[PDB]
Design a protein around this ligand. Sequence first.
Ligand code: HEM
Ligand SMILES: CC(=O)Cn1cnc2ccccc21
Ligand SMILES: CC(=O)Cn1cnc2ccccc21
Length: 289
Amino acid sequence: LVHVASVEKGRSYEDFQKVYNAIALKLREDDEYDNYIGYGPVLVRLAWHISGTWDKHDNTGGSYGGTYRFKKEFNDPSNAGLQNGFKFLEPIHKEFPWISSGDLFSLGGVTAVQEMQGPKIPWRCGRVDTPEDTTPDNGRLPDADKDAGYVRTFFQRLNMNDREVVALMGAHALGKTHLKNSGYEGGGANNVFTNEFYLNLLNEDWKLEKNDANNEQWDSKSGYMMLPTDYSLIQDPKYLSIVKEYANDQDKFFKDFSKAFEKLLENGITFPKDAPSPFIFKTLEEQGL
Ligand code: HEM
Ligand SMILES: CC(=O)Cn1cnc2ccccc21
Ligand SMILES: CC(=O)Cn1cnc2ccccc21
C-alpha cells in the first residue's frame, strides 16, 4: 500500500498554527480533567495509538487514514479511555473541519507535548481520511504485562530501534494508568513533559505487586508505579544504558524523543518531493497568547 500525503486544499502553515492554538487554548481551559491533570497526556496517548497500529510489512494501519474515527478501532480494548481525547478534539474539528482526521489526531499529540513544555516536534500535514474497510483489526498495540524481549520485537514492526523505543517510552512521564481502562493502578501523576520517567526508574525503590485487577506492576513506597514493560527497560542491559543516558541528559532526551515521535506519527506516509517542509509550531507562550 502507498499512502501519499496530500495537503488539505489551500492550506499553509498559518492555517495549522490556528488549529494548534485552538487545541492549546482548550488544553488551558479544560484544566479539571482527570483530577487536574488536564487533557495533555490523553492526547499524546491518542496520537501514539492512532500511529501504533502500523505494520511496516504491508503498510497497513498507521496515522494516515484517520481510522480511529471508525467503531472497530474506537472500540479496541487497547484504546479504552481514548474516547476522552476524541471528545476533546470534537469541537476543534467542528471549528476547523477542513483538517483531516489523521492530521487532527497527530497534531493533538504534538500540541500536547509542546504545551506541556516538551520539545518542539516538527509536524507534516497531508494525511487523508481512508474508508472504513481500511481500519486495522484490534490487537496491534502492545501488551503491558511483558518483558524486554517482547518490547524489542514488538517495536521492530514499527521500525523502531532500541534508542527510539527507550526515548518514546519517556512519554510515560505524563499522565497515569486507570484501573477501569487498562487494569493498572495509577500512581503519582504529572502534566509536564520532562525526563522524569528515567529518573523515577533509576532512583525509586521498586516492589513487584499484584493489583486488584490481578495484574502485576511495580510500585514504590513514594507512591509511583511502573508497568512491567516500563520496568523491562532497566532489566535489559541495552535498554538500561539508554535509560541512564536520558536520566542524565535532558536535552538529549528531548532531541531524541522529538525525532522518534515525529517518525512514529509519519510511519506509512510518502511525502512527495515538493511537499511542504515540516512545520514547527509556536507555543501559546511564544505567541504571547
Ligand atoms: C510497550 C509500550 C507501551 C505500553 C505497553 C503502554 C501501556 C500503557 C498503559 C497500560 C497506559 C494506561 C492507560 C490507562 O489506564 O488510561 C498508558 C498510558 C499512557 N501512555 Fe503508554 N504504553 C506504551 C508506550 C507508549 C508510548 C510509545 C507513548 C507515547 C509516545 C505512550 C504514552 C502514554 C501516555 C501519555 C499515557 C497516559 C495517558 C493518560 O494519562 O490518560 N505510551 N500506557
Ligand atoms: C466534530 C467532527 O467533525 C468529528 N470529527 C471528524 N474527525 C475527527 C477527528 C477528531 C475529532 C473529531 C473528528
Ligand atoms: C512518572 C511516571 O513514569 C509515571 N508512569 C510510569 N509508567 C506509566 C505508564 C503510563 C502512564 C504513566 C506512567
